[PDB]
Amino acid sequence: ELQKLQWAKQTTSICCYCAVGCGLIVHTAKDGQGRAVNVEGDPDHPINEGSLCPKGASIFQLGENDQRGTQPLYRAPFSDTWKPVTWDFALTEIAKRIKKTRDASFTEKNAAGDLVNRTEAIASFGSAAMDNEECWAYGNILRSLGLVYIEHQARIXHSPTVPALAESFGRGAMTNHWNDLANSDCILIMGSNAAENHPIAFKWVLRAKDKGATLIHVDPRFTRTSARCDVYAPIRSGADIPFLGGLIKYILDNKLYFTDYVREYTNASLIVGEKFSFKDGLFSGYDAANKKYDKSMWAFELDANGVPKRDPALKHPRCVINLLKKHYERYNLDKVAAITGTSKEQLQQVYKAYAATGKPDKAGTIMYAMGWTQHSVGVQNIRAMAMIQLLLGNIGVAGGGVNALRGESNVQGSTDQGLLAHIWPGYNPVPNSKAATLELYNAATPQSKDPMSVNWWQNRPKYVASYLKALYPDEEPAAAYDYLPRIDAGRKLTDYFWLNIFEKMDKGEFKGLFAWGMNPACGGANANKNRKAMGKLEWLVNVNLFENETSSFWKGPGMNPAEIGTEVFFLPCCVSIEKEGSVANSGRWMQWRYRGPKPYAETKPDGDIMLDMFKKVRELYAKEGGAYPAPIAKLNIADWEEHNEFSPTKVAKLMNGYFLKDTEVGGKQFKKGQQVPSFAFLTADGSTCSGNWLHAGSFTDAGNLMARRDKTQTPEQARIGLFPNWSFCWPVNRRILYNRASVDKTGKPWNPAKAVIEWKDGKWVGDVVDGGGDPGTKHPFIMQTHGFGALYGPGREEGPFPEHYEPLECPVSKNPFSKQLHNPVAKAVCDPRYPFIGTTYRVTEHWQTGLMTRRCAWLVEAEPQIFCEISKELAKLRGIGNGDTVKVSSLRGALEAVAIVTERIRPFKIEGVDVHMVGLPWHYGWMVPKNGGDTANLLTPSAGDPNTGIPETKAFMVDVRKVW
Amino acid sequence: GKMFFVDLSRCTACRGCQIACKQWKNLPAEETRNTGSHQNPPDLSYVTLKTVRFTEKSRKGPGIDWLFFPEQCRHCVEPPCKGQADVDLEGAVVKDETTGAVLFTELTAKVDGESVRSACPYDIPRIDPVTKRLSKCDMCNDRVQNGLLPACVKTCPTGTMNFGDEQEMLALAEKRLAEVKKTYPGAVLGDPNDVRVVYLFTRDPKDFYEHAVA
Ligand SMILES: Nc1nc2c(c(=O)[nH]1)N[C@H]1C(S)=C(S)[C@@H](COP(=O)(O)OP(=O)(O)OC[C@H]3O[C@@H](n4cnc5c(=O)[nH]c(N)nc54)[C@H](O)[C@@H]3O)O[C@H]1N2
Ligand SMILES: Nc1nc2c(c(=O)[nH]1)N[C@H]1C(S)=C(S)[C@@H](COP(=O)(O)OP(=O)(O)OC[C@H]3O[C@@H](n4cnc5c(=O)[nH]c(N)nc54)[C@H](O)[C@@H]3O)O[C@H]1N2
Ligand code: SF4
Ligand code: SF4
Ligand code: SF4
Ligand code: SF4
Ligand SMILES: [S]
Ligand SMILES: [W+6]
């Protein structure tokens, strides 16, 4: 016996940091009745096998931390101190601020006369840190109250992926999963620092190398990742599309594509209409006035029945494949080497290694995260990766895929539950003002006349109706549709997003803000503006683990509390290991975790906080009346609680869904009250409810599949590491998406030694088949309208093929690929006093703004202060020595940091001129610790673009000067 | 006896091990500051039994060779620290018969601490300025006796850290050296006959740290 763990109860959990989803074991004193005594890795968990990086390994110090919030705090207008208060007072006075603001601001109809039933005076930020059941309930609370300005983290790092991959494959998700990396023959890490930012992933990456894989890192900087790769290839900031376009040309020229895969499973054979063209950096249909394309000019030639025409011989000049060859012929090794700053020799090595996976029995994977996509062409970067993977036959196969690495532990889930302004749960769009009825809403879904095209989104009416039955089970869907708010069809979508919320806040156009599980005073670009802007709120609610730069912005640097009238409520929530629920990892694994210690002091789970808060609003409306009360009063919250508190289990069951009456579906009989066994059995006629159609299958009559801890595998499952009985992944436990593309038209794997699925005597064996049907009878991309993986993608704002448009403004004046320098569908000053390219990035030991990890002594011990990494070249130019204090300044602000002079950073050669890059971590802030430094977002700009709404935190102009 | 095999060709310098060592023993954090390096704490101390040392070496072409060294007591088969100290008082330093762990006890407060550090060819022992006790890595001996991996080994995500019976681990180190040489031709095992913590270095051990090897 170990004395430390003797007498303690042992429970399982899931790490509260990144989207790898490592398992924990928690030991809690007094057989569960006290505090945590130990937290370490779960040896039985198939992803981490007991391993933890320093963040996961220090969760004990996060949880049993004496700096944590103990009870609600209240800050009165113009006050200069906190005042401790009861939960009763806090939630009561908050409910009144919500009701007072809603009643005064609510608008039933917009100016144009259309019903919108919303308030625009309240906005919410957060959060990927909440459990899936909490994220779901939170969004529905905010929308029942009529909010439209609902955003979180996902805007920055996740939102570019979703339309890039949806256009390409039919879904926005990461295509494979972590364990599957071990099956790859060549791993290209580009726009990712996975060894630092997804550390347990490198378990599987190195096991790939053990079996013969080549590891390639493409990054402007040499990192801890680069140290363990076979090839490090430097790239100039923003030169990614040239890099990837040259690889496409290389693949085509050298005939390294997977011919049969390309002909059968991509849109290579489809005939594009005569109205498509490209010249001098512009596609056809360009409107120079409105900076926009007429995309109908990009449409396919349709046959008699409305189906795009196909030449299987791939000879017609307007075949996608022939147009693709033509488009990328400009991306020769010489031009690409010049702009990327990668040597021709290294380009050839990288291209050769990776394009070799075009062999049917070889697999290549691409790993990317947020680093490379913080600009207006980020969507087209990811498109290029998808296109390469399709040419090589790497989509649907083991060791292949586009592994778009999710950031936070539940950013997949928080996005899945519709905590962005444009989506409901299950990626059903938020209605605009012109979707006047449910039938009109449902009318927007494209149909296919191809009988081999499953076109699964035609089932959308079942999903929207089932969702509406979950919130308002006593109403007809068509009636319930009118309760939830709608955005204006007139306005650009980006008016409702992250960056514009800060803009509107600065104009005094919001009364209240929820800062729920976020630290925007540090995480928002242009921090000086945001910090000032928050002083123009009437009230602010911060729900958080600790006091922070957001909760206490009013006594931040340069701020006078007496001049600031914002009323602030701080509500302390509990840590991950003090509550029960699920989190959805990057591979869509929806994993259940359990309560170890009880909540610290008087902290509460988010579920209890939000539910209590809503109930008080509900009470106020019941006794006072007010603005359009029906959405609030009728909302089904009884399904959300048990024994007087938020119930994770019951919400999860509602999210899965259940039959509201006896129902026949798909030739099966179902009784009232039964759990819906999959989304295939949902209905549009009110027979079924389901809070999220993606969750249908996750919690059935067989019980909670998310809580399965079963490592049982068949040989073929174990060979590639599917672990199908460990937890549950959407959709319906399909671990590798698009897996029908991994077999020929008889159902035989391209690579039998790494089979994903296989037709074996009447059925599919291995993974769950992504789309039912005998071999050869269905197109493999079942969420696409036409059924094919899209090389040519005419739904994208910037054009159907990725094209280099310079994302760097200041150091560049000419585009070597065309006459169009910048993105033609998207005001940088470039003041000569700031000649260096600043960039921000992460280290292994800190998390996000550092709110959490700056409170953990062991992590501060390893990384105690903000630093500034520079080359020997820039150090010599500016007379900076390793470890000197430097001042980094921009048009937006200034800070001090410790200099780190390293050969890991080198100058860029841009248009014949040396241009220096300056690297900062964005993990620091003024509140804690002593001498740590403040946020790198003092320096960053907040001028996004009307397409993405993303600020440029990866390339912004600065100066660096030595201080004494 | 038990042994660690530490394959430094797989290390990402995540510092999982550094943190996990402190979590298991509930060790205090030092006061640190950045002096132009990711390395911190700068050195082993009474309260730091393991730190990851970072070294940058120029190479031809882009990038560097970035060398990482998670430092700990080598648990010597013939421990000089015990040979010293046994001069002043036996029982200050003992060796576990079953595991092969070399263990400092409370009686180290009574011996010549400074002298015991000098006797160490790896410069491992550290002194408490107050109680004069000596501290270092204890092989997580209690965990090992209870059939658990040491904290730093279990936490490691890359397979850098390996632990087990001495014959298995020596067999593993020989097998792995052969495989690793195909990528790093100048790879060597550190003092493999003298110690119970066998590092595989990708090149000259002294590049990783001046006391990497005896
Ligand atoms: N340790 C740790 N891990 C984390 C986090 C954390 O805070 N700390 N945060 C999590 C979250 S929320 C997210 S979204 C992810 C993000 O994960 P990453 O995207 O890996 O994060 P970054 O370090 O910001 O950027 C990755 C790399 O992009 C490189 N880069 C910069 N500009 C370019 C460019 O133009 N082209 C290319 N090819 N590369 C470029 C940077 O040099 C950097 O090495 O990390 C997650 N994991
Ligand atoms: N310059 C620059 N800016 C960036 C980025 C960058 O790379 N560079 N990255 C961007 C990206 S991708 C991201 S993800 C954002 C992140 O920005 P934020 O999310 O604002 O960052 P933090 O608040 O540090 O994230 C962790 C938060 O989770 C909270 N938390 C933890 N557990 C719980 C819980 O159970 N309940 C609740 N309610 N809260 C909990 C912690 O209290 C803390 O506030 O920053 C963005 N900003
Ligand atoms: S932060 Fe990510 S890699 Fe590290 S322990 Fe947690 S889930 Fe695993
Ligand atoms: S935990 Fe493993 S990979 Fe990470 S620094 Fe320690 S030995 Fe290296
Ligand atoms: S490394 Fe030094 S302290 Fe550790 S057993 Fe050997 S001589 Fe003793
Ligand atoms: S074996 Fe135990 S005491 Fe030694 S470094 Fe590892 S965790 Fe620390
Ligand atoms: S995120
Ligand atoms: W993120």
How close does chain B come to A939, measured CA to CA in Å?
Answer: 21
Whether chain B has a CB inside 8 Å of the CB on A543: the answer is: no
- Which residues of chain B make contact with A857, given a CB cutoff of 8 A? 28-29
- What are the angstrom distances between the C-alpha of A63 and each of A18, A37, A441, A820? 17, 10, 46, 53
Contact across the interface for A931 and B33, Cβ inside 8 Å: yes
Q: Do residues A183 and A742 make contact, with C-beta atoms less than 8 angstroms apart?
A: no
Cis before A425 (ω within 30): no
- Cβ of A153 closer than 6 Å to ligand 7, yes or no, is yes
Residue B186 burial (CB count, 10 A) = 9
Closest residue by Cα to atom 3, ligand 6, is: B137
- Cβ of A847 closer than 6 Å to ligand 1, yes or no, is yes
- Cβ of B75 closer than 6 Å to ligand 6, yes or no, is no
Q: Which two tokens stand for residue B86?
A: 């046994």
Contact across the interface for B38 and A863, Cβ inside 8 Å: yes
CATH 1.20.120.450, applies to B80-139: no
Axis crossing angle, helix A132-144 with helix A648-656, rounded to the nearest 10: 80
Q: Do residues A511 and A537 make contact, with C-beta atoms less than 8 angstroms apart?
A: yes
Contact across the interface for A865 and B149, Cβ inside 8 Å: no
Q: Do residues A244 and A381 make contact, with C-beta atoms less than 8 angstroms apart?
A: yes
* Torsion over CA: A255, A256, A262, A267 (sign): negative
State chain B's maximal CA–CA distance in angstroms.
Answer: 56
By CB atoms closer than 10 A (0-12, 13-18, 19+), residue A697 is buried
Q: Which two tokens stand for residue A263?
A: 């002909």
Contact across the interface for B156 and A226, Cβ inside 8 Å: no
Pocket of ligand 4 (CB under 6 A): B 11-17, 52, 70, 155-158, 160-161
CA of A406 to the centre of ligand 8 (A): 7
By DSSP bridging, strand A913-915 and strand A836-841 are unpaired
Residue A522 is assigned to a ligand binding site: no
Q: Which two tokens stand for residue A649?
A: 């289990």
Q: Do residues A375 and A196 make contact, with C-beta atoms less than 8 angstroms apart?
A: no
Q: Which ligand is nearest to the CA of A413?
A: 7
Q: Which of A40, A42, A47, A53 is nearest to A847 (CA)?
A: A53
Q: Which 313-372 residues of chain A touch chain B by CB within 8 A? A: 346
How close does chain B come to A20, measured CA to CA in Å?
Answer: 12
Q: Which helix (H) or strand (E) holds B212?
A: none
CA dist A613 and A621 (Å) reads 13
Q: What is the CATH number of the domain that holds A200?
A: 3.40.228.10
Three-class secondary structure assignment of B111-137: CCHHHHHHHCCCCCCEECCCCCCEECC
Q: Which two tokens stand for residue B116?
A: 């015991």
**Single-letter code of the amino acid located at A85:** V
DSSP string, A526-583: SHHHHHHHHTT-SEEEEEESS--TTTTGGGSTT--GGG---EEEEEEBPPGGGS-EEE
First to last CA, chain B: 21
Quick one: which atom of ligand 1 is closest to the CA of A238?
35
Residue A53 is assigned to a ligand binding site: yes
- Which residues of chain B make contact with A228, given a CB cutoff of 8 A? 10-12, 158
Q: Do residues A762 and A806 make contact, with C-beta atoms less than 8 angstroms apart?
A: no
Structure-determination approach: X-ray
Q: Which 922-941 residues of chain A touch chain B by CB within 8 A? A: 931
Domain boundaries, chain B: 2-75+143-208, 80-139
Q: Which of A487, A483, A538, A484 is nearest to A510 (CA)?
A: A538
Residue B14 is assigned to a ligand binding site: yes
Q: Which domain holds residue A372?
A: 161-405
Cis before A929 (ω within 30): yes
First to last CA, chain A: 56
Q: Which two tokens stand for residue A879?
A: 């007379």
- DSSP H helix total and E strand total for chain B: 7, 10
- Cβ of B152 closer than 6 Å to ligand 5, yes or no, is no
Closest by Cβ to A860, choosing from B18, B29, B35: B29
Which of B18, B67, B158, B160 is best to mutate for the A interface (most A CBs within 10 A)?
Answer: B158
Q: Which of A960, A841, A798 is nearest to A894 (CA)?
A: A960
Q: Do residues B154 and B164 make contact, with C-beta atoms less than 8 angstroms apart?
A: no
CA B45 from centroid of its chain's CA atoms: 13
User: Hey, what CATH class is B2-75+143-208 in?
Assistant: alpha beta
Which of A17, A25, A52 is best to mutate for the B interface (most B CBs within 10 A)?
Answer: A52
CA of A197 to the centre of ligand 1 (A): 7
CA of B189 to the centre of ligand 4 (A): 18
Closest by Cβ to B20, choosing from A57, A867, A901: A57
Q: Do residues A125 and A550 make contact, with C-beta atoms less than 8 angstroms apart?
A: no
Residue B96 is assigned to a ligand binding site: no
Mutational pocket test of ligand 2: of A18, A68, A133, A153, the residue with most ligand atoms within 8 Å of the beta carbon: A153
Which of A6, A10, A51 is best to mutate for the B interface (most B CBs within 10 A)?
Answer: A51
CA angle, residues A334, A335, A337, in degrees to nearest 5? 65
CA dist A620 and A614 (Å) reads 10
CA of B77 to the centre of ligand 5 (A): 9
Q: Which two tokens stand for residue A726?
A: 């460990």
Breaks (C-N over 2.5 A) in chain B follow: none
How close does chain B come to A607, measured CA to CA in Å?
Answer: 30
Quick one: which atom of ligand 6 is closest to the CA of B24?
7
Q: Which ligand is nearest to the CA of A241?
A: 1
Q: Which helix (H) or strand (E) holds A490?
A: none
Q: Do residues A516 and A139 make contact, with C-beta atoms less than 8 angstroms apart?
A: no
Alpha helices in chain B (DSSP H): 16-25, 80-83, 113-119, 141-145, 151-155, 166-180, 205-208
- DSSP H helix total and E strand total for chain A: 27, 42
The resolution, in Å, is 2.0
**Single-letter code of the amino acid located at A711:** K
- Cβ of A856 closer than 6 Å to ligand 1, yes or no, is no
Whether chain B has a CB inside 8 Å of the CB on A58: the answer is: yes
Which residues fall within 8 angstroms of residue A517, CB to CB, at 6 or more apart?
A126, A127, A128, A129, A130, A543, A544, A573, A606
Contact across the interface for B155 and A57, Cβ inside 8 Å: yes
Q: CA dihedral defined by A675, A676, A678, A679, rounded to 10 degrees?
A: -140
- Which residues of chain B make contact with A199, given a CB cutoff of 8 A? 12, 14, 16, 157
- Which residues of chain B make contact with A884, given a CB cutoff of 8 A? 36
Residue whose structure tokens are 């031809």: B60
Whether chain B has a CB inside 8 Å of the CB on A859: the answer is: yes
Which residues fall within 8 angstroms of residue A390, CB to CB, at 6 or more apart?
A168, A261, A262, A265, A266, A789, A790, A791
Task: State which residues have CB under 5 angstroms from ligand 8, the bound ion.
Answer: A 153, 157, 407
CA of A528 to the centre of ligand 5 (A): 53
Do B80-139 and B2-75+143-208 have the same topology in CATH?
yes
Q: Which two tokens stand for residue A697?
A: 């299958």
Quick one: which atom of ligand 5 is closest to the CA of B93?
8
Q: Which 822-851 residues of chain A touch chain B by CB within 8 A? A: 843-845
